[PDB]
């Protein structure tokens, strides 16, 4: 029914408005709705700046069970030192509004990338995907994942080498996970932009050493970005290969042979999927789908890159293939409902790795969905 599709498109602004009102009401009416454990970490990290206790910092106020640390790169603390100058509520409401606006802007950038501009459809997409498990997880925790997605797609949209390079470098300096997006630029043969993005990431490392130095150092040696310190590896929310393999195993294999084989097979699948795509949005979406699978820690709130992927599926060049519609609706039903969020209740505690067949096998849900999408893209491209 394309008529109903047009009717709902016309009802965009007054559906995104409803979604934003509902989200804002929930956050500031329910206890722990505006808890913002990761925004409070970003605010209390730099708040201790200049006192030699920034990475030894722990934040158990909001989750006594698990003390939230400041695992971000020191450049993130440099960037968040201004947040120390803003009252907590004036920053919480600002951050929620910023994440919402970043979601709308990234949807608009995805539409532009696909070759069409549609403010109403962008509002509808923002409202519908606002409640996808990754987006609601980011909003709940205050984690900056929509903002970095916006920065990365802004870099992709801008053909100018310096703009894209600087955006990618700064965004990757704030968090190391989005650095995998740079690989897309390697695939796009944008060698100069990739070089500049790497240079900016190194200059962000230098800034972090300068400002947050003498307290946060050796961030790559003796630490290796160890997944354990960031958080539990086996918890179902950790939807990377490592999380699901640990669930089905009962013990974190980590760099084990069996995890390495999975890493290699997903590497080949993602490379074939990218080889099966030709448009910027699809290429970046495949690259980030692979990044979410290879990173040692990829919580649900990291999987906000799926939203541009669904936009590509339902509007990109493959808005006709039977498989394209099938997998777009599959991703929508999976994320909107959220299997990992539902399964997280079954496990005794976030630190329990042993699982029976149901709670372990169902823990491979998002991994299996991503691998199925990658294999489908590879086979359809090869054919």
């Amino acid at each position: 029914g394309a008529s109903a599709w047009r009717r709902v498109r016309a009802w965009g602004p007054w559906l995104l408005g409803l979604s934003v009102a509902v989200r804002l009401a929930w956050a500031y009416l329910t206890p722990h709705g505006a808890d913002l454990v990761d925004l409070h970490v970003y605010v209390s990290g730099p708040a201790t700046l200049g006192h030699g206790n920034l990475y030894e910092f722990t934040y158990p106020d909001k989750t006594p069970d698990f003390p939230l640390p400041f695992t971000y790169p020191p450049f993130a603390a440099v960037v968040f030192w201004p947040l120390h100058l803003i009252p907590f509520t004036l920053l919480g409401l600002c951050w929620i509004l910023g994440t919402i606006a970043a979601l709308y802007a990234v949807v608009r950038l995805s539409q532009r990338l696909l070759g069409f501009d549609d403010a109403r459809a962008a509002a509808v997409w923002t409202a519908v995907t606002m409640w996808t498990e990754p987006v609601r997880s980011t909003l709940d925790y205050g984690q900056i994942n929509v903002l970095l997605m916006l920065l990365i797609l802004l870099a992709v949209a801008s053909s100018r080498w310096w703009i894209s390079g600087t955006l990618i470098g700064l965004a990757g300096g704030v968090k190391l996970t989005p650095l995998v997006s740079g690989l897309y630029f390697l695939g796009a043969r944008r060698w100069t932009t990739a070089i500049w993005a790497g240079v900016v990431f190194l200059l962000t490392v230098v800034v972090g050493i300068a400002v947050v130095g003498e307290q946060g150092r050796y961030y790559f040696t003796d630490l290796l970005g160890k997944p354990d310190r960031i958080g539990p590896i086996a918890t179902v929310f950790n939807q990377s290969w490592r999380g699901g393999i640990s669930r089905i195993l009962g013990h974190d294999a980590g760099s084990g042979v069996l995890v390495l084989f999975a890493y290699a097979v997903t590497a080949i699948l993602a490379f074939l999927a990218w080889r099966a795509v030709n448009d910027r949005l699809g290429q970046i979406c495949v690259v980030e789908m692979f990044g979410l699978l290879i990173s040692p820690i990829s919580w649900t709130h990291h999987w906000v890159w799926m939203v541009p992927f669904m936009v590509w599926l339902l509007h990109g060049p493959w808005r006709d293939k039977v498989g394209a519609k099938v997998f777009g609706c599959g991703w929508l039903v999976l994320l909107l409902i959220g299997v990992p969020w539902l399964l997280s209740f079954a496990q005794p505690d976030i630190w329990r790795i042993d699982r029976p067949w149901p709670l372990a096998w169902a823990g491979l849900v998002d991994i299996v969905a991503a691998i199925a999408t990658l294999t489908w893209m590879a086979v359809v491209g090869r054919r």
Partner: antibody
């Protein structure tokens, strides 16, 4: 498969109105920008209108500004361009073509169409 | 935006490479396309973004950015490839097709 059909192209008195209609088949208007290009006898092509059909932004030339108002119809896949006080020198062959509009963010948005991939037949306005 | 192209009928010989200029003022990046229009028909797009040819267009066709200037080059007129060729700049504000140029 993909076809473009133009049912307009009537004859009008100097001053008046005329409604060109460019039916489309095999693709979705919303995903492409429909353009109207005219070509007077003895002269070359001249761009007339560049509706986007998704954002609804209407772009038409300066000498075209005061005499044209290009519409759109995504439901029926038609362009539906309109004139008023025309026929001073507007006798031409108004083709209609679609194009893919690709955007870049050079600190501010700058649309540019990739090119008129598919063209309809000729009209006789 | 004032716009002009090469003189019409600047290459009439058959069996040789043909060149043509797409003089454009201001700066339109790579938003230039070239079209083939046989008389009594509708133009057929040849190259999009002035660098890559369209699908189905013979591989002999090739357009290249000569700075702010644009050119269209093919192999020859072996398969009776004679028609009036046009080039435009697509800045999304005011599209101009320039002067008509016959093969």
């Amino acid at each position: 498969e993909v076809q473009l059909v133009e049912s307009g192209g009537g004859l009008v008195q100097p001053g008046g109105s005329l409604r060109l209609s460019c039916a489309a088949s095999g693709f979705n208007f919303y995903y492409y920008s429909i353009h109207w290009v005219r070509q007077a006898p003895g002269k070359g092509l001249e761009w007339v209108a560049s509706i986007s059909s998704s954002s609804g932004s209407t772009s038409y030339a300066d000498s075209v500004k005061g005499r044209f108002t290009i519409s759109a119809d995504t439901s029926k896949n038609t362009a539906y361009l309109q004139m008023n006080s025309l026929a001073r020198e507007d006798t031409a062959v108004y083709y209609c073509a679609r194009s893919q509009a690709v955007y870049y963010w050079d600190l501010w948005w700058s649309m540019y169409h990739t090119g008129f991939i598919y063209w309809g037949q000729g009209t006789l306005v | 935006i004032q716009m002009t192209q090469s003189p019409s009928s600047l290459s009439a010989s058959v069996g040789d490479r043909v060149t043509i200029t797409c003089r454009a003022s201001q700066s339109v990046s790579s938003a230039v396309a070239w079209y083939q229009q046989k008389p009594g028909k509708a133009p057929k797009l040849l190259i999009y973004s002035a660098s890559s040819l369209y699908s189905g267009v013979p591989s002999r066709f090739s357009g290249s950015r000569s700075g702010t200037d644009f050119t269209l080059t093919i192999s020859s007129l072996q398969p009776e490839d004679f028609a009036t060729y046009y080039c435009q700049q697509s800045s999304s504000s005011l599209i101009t097709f320039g002067q008509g140029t016959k093969v």
